[PDB]
């Protein structure tokens, strides 16, 4: 619901990568259970669209651990390594809830228009990708 913006100081990047690739993962077993609905009416520029929509939905739900866990770390200052962040993917990969997102655009009817340029961006490599919360 609501969020404090902190600016933390002993941000690794590198981790950061390694932490994405494990969420994306555990966030793309679900993403084909949605496809194995919608399959059959899924047009092509769909496809290439629902890898933008989970990034907004990351963004989205990285809010709700924002509080949790990266308060936590800057407060304390410790810098968590590897195999700690993979632990934190595993529970972040564990809900997964893009119905909740596609209800609410649907809603709201803010489909946006197909892109070339939307298309060449979801292509380009995630640890290349820049990461933004909300």
Same mark, same amino acid.
């Given at each position: 619901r609501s969020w404090h913006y902190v600016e933390p100081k002993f941000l690794n %990047?590198? =981790?950061?990568?390694?932490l994405?690739?494990?969420?994306?993962?555990? =966030?793309? #077993?679900?993403?084909? %259970?949605?496809? /194995?609905?919608?399959? @059959?009416?899924?047009?092509t520029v769909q496809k290439k669209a629902?890898? =933008?929509?989970? /990034? #907004?939905?990351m963004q989205t739900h990285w809010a709700n651990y924002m509080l949790w866990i990266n308060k936590k770390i800057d407060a304390l200052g410790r810098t968590p390594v590897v195999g700690d962040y993979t632990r934190l993917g595993?529970?972040?990969? /564990? #809900?997964?809830?893009?119905?909740? =997102?596609?209800?609410?655009?649907?809603?709201?009817? &803010?489909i946006p228009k197909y892109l070339p340029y939307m298309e060449?961006?979801? @292509? &380009? @490599?995630?640890?290349?990708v820049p990461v933004k919360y909300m």
């Open positions: %990047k590198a =981790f950061e990568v390694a994405k690739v494990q969420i994306i993962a555990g =966030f793309d #077993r679900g993403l084909v %259970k949605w496809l /194995r609905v919608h399959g @059959r009416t899924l047009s629902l890898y =933008f929509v989970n /990034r #907004r939905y595993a529970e972040i990969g /564990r #809900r997964i809830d893009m119905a909740y =997102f596609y209800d609410a655009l649907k809603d709201k009817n &803010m060449e961006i979801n @292509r &380009m @490599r995630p640890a290349d």
